[PDB]
Structure 1
């Protein structure tokens, strides 16, 4: 009864794991990435977040009403996290050829990490909601 949930048709789960993987990709290849490629890894993280927000949006009407507002808040937290990452990416671009380059990239990594952690929190929230839905039914 404490076994992992069946993820076969679980779109939210798929998109959360894709987002975490995209963050891992950014983290892995940021050190060797040329300045013009900063927008590419960040847009890709953002693209995966867009799908996650979409998949949660579709699910929300079928989750218990008491679950929806906290899940909505976590969606807005992910948006705030992405805004922060974009900000750090811009700073990294502005300071490509200055002595602030390494610090800006360090802050990009930190912002991207926070986004992935908050994505996992959304997954937990959605999983809880689905369990509580099965209780009401």
Structure 2
């Protein structure tokens, strides 16, 4: 349903458009890309926090679990990003540009999982 769905979509969109800009773009333009995805992530997390109290208390812990995973993913992304910033040598750059993409997408997939967890909790209200 919308609020949460809309912000999950915004995060996926952000991941797609950061992934599009990786290949062409230098390093000097890698933190900004990740910064944007991170800001899109924070908005989604705050949106889920606002939705938690209206869901059965027995679903909280799991929702939190899905929330923490995304933070871990963002950490893994920034981690790969550091490597692509430092090593501009082509062979190393192509490799780390690739690991950033893969890590960014892992985030989009867990964002979707968080969504599935919210819907599951909403259905528990039946």
TM exceeding 0.5: yes
Of 122-131 and 72-81, the range deviating more from structure 2: 122-131
Whether 1:125 aligns to 2:117 is yes
| RMSD of aligned residue pairs (Cα, Å) | 1.0
- Taking structure 1 as the reference length, what is the TM-score of the superposition? 0.88
The equivalent residue for 1:26 is 18
Runs of 4+ in 1 over 3 A off after TM superposition: none
- Taking structure 2 as the reference length, what is the TM-score of the superposition? 0.96
Gapped regions of structure 2 (runs ≥ 5): none
Give the C-alpha shift of residue 35 in structure 1. 1.2
Give the C-alpha shift of residue 100 in structure 1. 1.0
Of structures 1 and 2, the one with the larger relative CO (CA 8 A, separation 6+) is 2
Mapped to 2, the partners of 1:14 and 1:36 lie a distance apart of 30
Whether 1:56 aligns to 2:48 is yes
Equivalenced residue count is 126
